[PDB]
Amino acid sequence: ALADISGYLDVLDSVRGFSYLENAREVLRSGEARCLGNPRSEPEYVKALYVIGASRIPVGDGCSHTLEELGVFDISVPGEMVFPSPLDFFERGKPTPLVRSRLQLPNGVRVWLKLEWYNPFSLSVADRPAVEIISRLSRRVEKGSLVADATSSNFGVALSAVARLYGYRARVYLPGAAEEFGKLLPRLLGAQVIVDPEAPSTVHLLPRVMKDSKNEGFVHVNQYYNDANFEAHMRGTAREIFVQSRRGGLALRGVAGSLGTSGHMSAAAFYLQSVDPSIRAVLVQPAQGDSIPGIARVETGMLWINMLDISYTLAEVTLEEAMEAVVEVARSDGLVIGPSGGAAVKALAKKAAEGDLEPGDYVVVVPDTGFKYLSLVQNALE
């Protein structure tokens, strides 16, 4: 028997750990899940179902229900694209677009582009963690409290818009080298914003955010460590690849992406590799000395890409190379991607070049619009 999952979403404030994900891998790999006689005695299982994007849970004595029965494949989007609020537009106006590129890579490597700038608050992938974190937070923290964190840019914009739609106050902390939209947009959205000229990278800002949090009593929502960030991308970004690939007719053979916290490619890779372990995750290690805004090298410390059981390859990419690839997607497809997007296009293009990749469909996750990166656009043409 099928019942509604909303009711059982207290397991989000009770399950801790990753042992619950073993349940995910089996439900996904099997394509079904066993019915639960007592839904409250199985907090791990229930949580797993939510995290793969079920809307319902299977309840009863011995039965089982498919992914489609559970609602992994439910279409959310109103055909007409009419939404009674912005927050509901984020929720139900999904999946973000998967667009097949005219870009031609060798060895029959077919490039598809998941356009995460089609998120309403930050025009970036960072909306999805920011709604998931703040939504859970609304359960426990009182309204009018200040929530805060460090960001390269996207998440601080997403945090500020969403915090303020949930009644919470916002502080964002940015490194000096980040972009003007990040420093400016939160303020337009009513946050306080603090910029450290000395801080060369976002992870380096963390001690300052932690110190101030202890002194001031704001809630440091902490995207690097906060398990919702991984979980948002499991029920949203990753699940969508799973669904779209199937409904799209895609022979899905892999994913390509970029890493800051590692939330979204950890989630795409794990989800996808639960359904089918052969799927490569091609990931980008920005080259040494170069800065690509939004992302970093793994060995600067990342939670999920390390600890979860994820087969992934790295290709090195310079900024200059990430920018070359922006330029060529823009001449191929006429779509203008951000620097981190072109870094994952480039990184796939090399494994393709090398002959390390099977013939088939690859989905790249493009994290934001190039319209926010005019300087790096300009410099890449001169």
Residue numbers belonging to the annotated binding site:
154, 260-264, 340
Considering only 124, 160, 226, 369, the residue that binds ligand E1U (CB under 6 A) is: 124
Question: Which CB sits closer to ligand E1U, 20 or 155?
Answer: 155
- Asked if 169 and 142 count as a contact pair (C-beta separation under 8 A), the reply is no
Give the x/- contact pattern for ligand E1U in 270-309, rule: CB under 6 A: ------------------------xxx-------------
Q: Decide if residue 160 touches ligand E1U (CB under 6 A).
A: no
| Smallest distance, ligand E1U to C-beta of residue 113, A | 14
Considering only 96, 119, 152, 274, the residue that binds ligand E1U (CB under 6 A) is: 152
Report the distance separating Cα 348 and Cα 110, nearest Å.
Answer: 10
| Smallest distance, ligand E1U to C-beta of residue 12, A | 20
Report the distance separating Cα 129 and Cα 236, nearest Å.
Answer: 10
- Asked if 158 and 126 count as a contact pair (C-beta separation under 8 A), the reply is yes
Structure tokens belonging to residue 180 = 């003007």
Strands 280-286 and 2-4, sheet pairing: unpaired
Q: Decide if residue 21 touches ligand E1U (CB under 6 A).
A: no
* Residue 332, beta-bridge partner list: none
Q: Decide if residue 226 touches ligand E1U (CB under 6 A).
A: no
Report the distance separating Cα 41 and Cα 13, nearest Å.
Answer: 15
Report the distance separating Cα 324 and Cα 376, nearest Å.
Answer: 10
| Cα Rg of the chain, angstroms | 20
Q: Decide if residue 119 touches ligand E1U (CB under 6 A).
A: no
- Asked if 294 and 339 count as a contact pair (C-beta separation under 8 A), the reply is yes
Q: Decide if residue 263 touches ligand E1U (CB under 6 A).
A: yes
Residue numbers belonging to the annotated binding site for pyridoxal 5'-phosphate:
154, 260-264, 340
Report the distance separating Cα 265 and Cα 267, nearest Å.
Answer: 5
| Smallest distance, ligand E1U to C-beta of residue 261, A | 3
Question: Which CB sits closer to ligand E1U, 160 or 244?
Answer: 160
CA-CA distances (angstroms) from residue 44 to 28, 48, 51, 374? 15, 6, 11, 46
Q: Which residue is nearest to ligand E1U (CB)?
A: 260
Structure tokens belonging to residue 133 = 């974190």
Considering only 23, 96, 119, 153, the residue that binds ligand E1U (CB under 6 A) is: 153
Q: Decide if residue 245 touches ligand E1U (CB under 6 A).
A: no
Q: Which stretch binds ligand E1U (CB under 6 A): 49-57, 185-193, 254-262, 329-337?
A: 254-262
- Residue 15: phi, psi to the nearest 5? -60, 135
Q: Decide if residue 260 touches ligand E1U (CB under 6 A).
A: yes
Residues that bind ligand E1U (CB under 6 A): 124-126, 151-155, 202, 258-264, 294-296, 338, 340, 367-368
